[PDB]
């Protein structure tokens, strides 16, 4: 009866206020609402505090509503998912002390150009971070420190030129890393650490293949089967790996995983393997 | 595992995969005995004859897996090694006597439907279950055939394999190999006159040989896949490290340091 | 001195714990009876 659509299944409520030209939240929606969709509205400015009630709200969708100012006021101790993608944010909202239960944060496609110091300070129990499509150029040392449980990190389509040598410190559970389509030319010393990365996307970058592109040289070699090329959703990037997608100077026929360091220092430290032959034969 | 079958989900929760970081390859198998202790074969880490010598920093431990190669979302757990302990009297020079090694995870692992510890044999359980004819069970992602020579069929499975094998009496074990046997190992497999087949194979080492107590219904790890000559060859038997006999050395390191 | 996990060991969540038996554990159980 309101302006939105109210539904259910189990002890959860789901309200859908998409594309309803709203400039604020349609007052008095089920107090037991768990999911809230306010997509494609006109919330140039929004107040979290305005949701203080509905104490069973877990998922909040404020995408495509051209938001430029989010007022982080009240608390949503049960909010877990938060989509702020496709908006006009120019500075990242400090959601630490406000959304303790958050596990998924998508601030993809906004107008972020850099990240605050203690950006994520507080949301330590976070699992997925989406920042694809912004214009970030550099990252803070310890940006993920507060988020040790992180499993997925998307930094594709940004203007990054160089990554913090110790960005990935901690992150024992990280499995997907999207960095495609940036302006990266080299990878720091021990950037990937000892951790195993199932799905990495590094294509669409101008990799400067010299003598300090060797670390990343062997890494590509070892993780050849873990490098994929992003196509789109529903695809499940678990379809045919492709380490050749990472190319020198983004130059086609110049895969980084096939670049002899010719006259480079230390003839045995970086990319010193490939000593024996192997003949594998697995099945369906 | 040769002549085995695909394992059921969570059927061998204690199954551990010994992963090599670079190049990325499955080396051996192993088993979980506690939230921070793994048990595998010694020669999986050290084998001077084949200049094999893996240090903590060269490996990873994948736990709670089913598929041999697919990363499994929120099913498997990847842990790093804090310390490797190979039996100080492991005989690599001749017959891999005391083929055993303990690994200490850098951080404890939480259990799940897929990740659980197996029990180690005690005085009575060892004496009760280790009898010729009684069947044990071996699991592993190892080769499905002798891969060093041309043979029909695939080399390694896509899913963890399982096979049930009868414990063979020493005499039969001894005279089936020219390799010198010790009290620290035992062999198992079907005899030429039994009809059924099955045996471990390369890549299966470290994997556990487990038996279920008919008394308390708990699964105990009686052995560790150690060696054999060929895979599932008539009149030939697989040899496993006798876990119980080495119980005193396990206890001694496991319980050595505080925490 | 410690490990952690025993007393609970050897009991599979998806099986013993749910009082379910896997497809071939019987093979093992029938092996404990003299086969003549
Ligand atoms: C399996 O692999 C291991 C390596 O993968 C083998 O161990 C390696 O052995 C060499 C010995 O040749 C070690 O050499 C360096 O360390 C020794 C000191 O040893 C002790 O302290 C180390 C910590 O610093 C530990 O890592 C060791 O385990 C041990 O406790 C130093 O004395 C050496 O210095 C020498 O060389 C430098 C030049 O670099 C000179 O300045 C010195 O004067 C001296 O001559 C080395 O720095 C090596 O560290 C060690 N690596 C590891 C991981 O332990 C292991 O032996 C092998 N197992 C078998 C049976 O082969
Ligand atoms: N048919 C079997 N059940 N085979 C089990 C072999 C398991 C395998 N082990 C092996 O391949 C070990 C290493 C040395 C040679 N070897 C063997 O199994 C061979 N018996 C040769 C040998 C025996 C005794 C002493 C020295 C050499 C492994 O760890 C995995 Cl790659
Ligand atoms: C990022 O690169 C794009 C593409 O050329 C450009 O339009 C934009 O101005 C760059 N952003 C910054 C902050 O440099």
Domains of chain B: 1-12+118-244 (2.40.10.10), 13-117+245-258 (2.40.10.10)
Q: Which of A196, A218, A283 sits opposite B60 (nearest CB)?
A: A196
C-alpha A152/C-alpha B151 separation (Å) is: 42
Report the first-to-last Cα separation within chain B, whole angstroms: 37
**Under a CB-based contact definition with an 8 Å cutoff, are residues A103 and A82 in contact?**
no
CATH number reported for the structural domain that contains residue A159 in this entry:
3.80.10.10
**Given CB atoms, is C3 within the 8 Å cutoff of chain B?**
yes
**Domain carrying residue A213:** 1-284
Q: Which residues of A touch B158 (CB under 8 A)?
A: 282-284
Fold category of C1-36 in CATH = Epsilon-Thrombin; Chain L (4.10.140)
C-alpha A209/C-alpha A138 separation (Å) is: 21
Q: Is the peptide bond before B23 cis (omega within 30 degrees of 0)?
A: yes
Q: Hey, CA dihedral for B25, B26, B28, B32, is it positive or negative?
A: positive
Q: Give me ligand 3 centre to Cα A115, in Å.
A: 16
Q: Hunting for tokens 């390859």 — which residue is that? A: B25
**Under a CB-based contact definition with an 8 Å cutoff, are residues A91 and A112 in contact?**
yes
Report the first-to-last Cα separation within chain A, whole angstroms: 53
Q: Which of A209, A166, A214, A167 has its CA nearest to residue A184?
A: A209
Could you give phi then psi for residue B253, rounded to 5 degrees? Answer: -90, -45
C-alpha A192/C-alpha A105 separation (Å) is: 23
Cβ C1–B35 below 8 Å, yes or no? Answer: no
Q: Is A243 in a helix, a strand, or coil? A: helix
Catalytic residues of B: 43, 99, 205
**Under a CB-based contact definition with an 8 Å cutoff, are residues A52 and A74 in contact?**
yes
> For residue B63, what are the CA distances in angstroms to B84, B164, C17?
17, 22, 20
Could you give phi then psi for residue B94, rounded to 5 degrees? Answer: -130, -60
Q: Which chains touch C (3 or more CB pairs under 8 A)?
A: B
- Strand A13-16 relative to strand A33-37: parallel, antiparallel, unpaired? parallel
Cβ B112–C13 below 8 Å, yes or no? Answer: yes
**Under a CB-based contact definition with an 8 Å cutoff, are residues C28 and B135 in contact?**
yes
**Given CB atoms, is C21 within the 8 Å cutoff of chain B?**
no
C-alpha A24/C-alpha A43 separation (Å) is: 6
Cβ B155–A225 below 8 Å, yes or no? Answer: no
Resolution in A: 3.2
Q: Which residues pair with B61 in a beta bridge?
A: B18, B79
> For residue B256, what are the CA distances in angstroms to A103, B252, C9?
40, 6, 21
C-alpha B92/C-alpha B245 separation (Å) is: 18
Q: Is A137 in a helix, a strand, or coil? A: coil
A284 to chain B, minimum CA–CA distance in Å?
7
Nearest CA in chain A to B157: A282
A213 to chain B, minimum CA–CA distance in Å?
18
**Under a CB-based contact definition with an 8 Å cutoff, are residues B39 and B85 in contact?**
no
Cβ A196–B155 below 8 Å, yes or no? Answer: no
Q: Which residues of B touch C16 (CB under 8 A)?
A: 217-218
C36 to chain B, minimum CA–CA distance in Å?
11
C-alpha A46/C-alpha A69 separation (Å) is: 7
**Under a CB-based contact definition with an 8 Å cutoff, are residues B119 and B18 in contact?**
no
Q: Which residues pair with B138 in a beta bridge?
A: B163, B209
Q: Which of A172, B73, A217, A274 has its CA nearest to residue A227?
A: A217
Q: Enter the tokens of residue A19.
A: 């594309």
Distance from the Cα of residue C22 to its chain's centroid: 9
Q: Which residues pair with B86 in a beta bridge?
A: B101
Tally of domains within chain A: 1
Does B have 3 or more CB contacts under 8 Å with C? yes
């Amino acid at each position: 009866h309101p302006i939105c659509e109210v539904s259910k299944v189990a002890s959860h409520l789901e309200v859908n206020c998409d594309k309803r030209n709203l400039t604020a939240l349609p007052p008095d929606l089920p107090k037991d609402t768990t999911i809230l969709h306010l997509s494609e509205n006109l919330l140039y400015t929004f107040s979290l505090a305005t949701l203080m009630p509905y104490t069973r709200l877990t998922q909040l969708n404020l995408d495509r509503a051209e938001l430029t100012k989010l007022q982080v006021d009240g608390t949503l101790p049960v909010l877990g998912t938060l989509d702020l993608s496709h908006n006009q944010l120019q500075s990242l909202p400090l959601l630490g002390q406000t959304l303790p239960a958050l596990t998924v944060l998508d601030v993809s496609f906004n107008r972020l150009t850099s990240l605050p110091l203690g950006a994520l300070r507080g949301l330590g129990e976070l699992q997925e971070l989406y920042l694809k499509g912004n214009e970030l150029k550099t990252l803070p040392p310890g940006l993920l420190t507060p988020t040790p449980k992180l499993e997925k990190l998307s930094l594709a389509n940004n203007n990054l030129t160089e990554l913090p040598a110790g960005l990935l410190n901690g992150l024992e559970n990280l499995d997907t890393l999207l960095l495609q389509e940036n302006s990266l030319y080299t990878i720091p010393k021990g950037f990937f650490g000892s951790h195993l990365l199932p799905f990495a996307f590094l294509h669409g970058n101008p990799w400067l293949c010299n003598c300090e592109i060797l670390y990343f040289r062997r890494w590509l070699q070892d993780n050849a089967e873990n490098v994929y090329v992003w196509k789109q959703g529903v695809d499940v990037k678990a379809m045919t790996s492709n380490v050749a997608s990472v190319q020198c100077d983004n130059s086609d026929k110049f895969p980084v995983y096939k670049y002899p360091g010719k006259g480079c220092p230390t003839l045995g430290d970086e990319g010193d393997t490939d000593l024996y032959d192997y003949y594998p034969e697995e099945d369906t | 595992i040769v002549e085995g079958s695909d394992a059921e989900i969570g059927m061998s929760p204690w199954q551990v995969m010994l992963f090599r970081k670079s190049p990325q390859e499955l080396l051996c198998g192993a088993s979980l005995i506690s939230d921070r202790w793994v048990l595998t074969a010694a020669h999986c880490l050290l084998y001077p004859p084949w200049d094999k010598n893996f240090t903590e920093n060269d490996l990873l431990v994948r736990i709670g897996k089913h598929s041999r190669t697919r990363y499994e979302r929120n099913i498997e757990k990847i842990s790093m090694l804090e310390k490797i302990y190979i039996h100080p009297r492991y005989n690599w020079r001749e017959n891999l006597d005391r083929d055993i090694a303990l690994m200490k995870l850098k951080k404890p692992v939480a259990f799940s439907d897929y990740i659980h510890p197996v029990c180690l044999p005690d005085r009575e359980t060892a004496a009760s279950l280790l009898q010729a004819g009684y069947k044990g069970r071996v699991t592993g992602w190892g080769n499905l055939k002798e891969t060093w020579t041309a043979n029909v069929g695939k080399g390694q499975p896509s899913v963890l394999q399982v096979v049930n094998l009868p414990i063979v009496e020493r005499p039969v074990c001894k005279d089936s190999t020219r390799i010198r046997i010790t009290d620290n190992m035992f062999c198992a497999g079907y005899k030429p006159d039994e009809g059924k087949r099955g045996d471990a194979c390369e890549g299966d080492s470290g994997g556990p040989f487990v038996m279920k107590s008919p008394f308390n219904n708990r699964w105990y790890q009686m052995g560790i896949v150690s060696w054999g000559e060929g895979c599932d060859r008539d009149g030939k038997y697989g040899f496993y490290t006798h876990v119980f006999r080495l119980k005193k050395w396990i206890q001694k390191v496991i319980d050595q340091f505080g925490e | 001195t410690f490990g952690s996990g025993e007393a609970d060991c050897g009991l599979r969540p998806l099986f013993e714990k749910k009082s379910l038996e896997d497809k071939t554990e019987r093979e093992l159980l029938e092996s404990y009876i003299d086969g003549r």
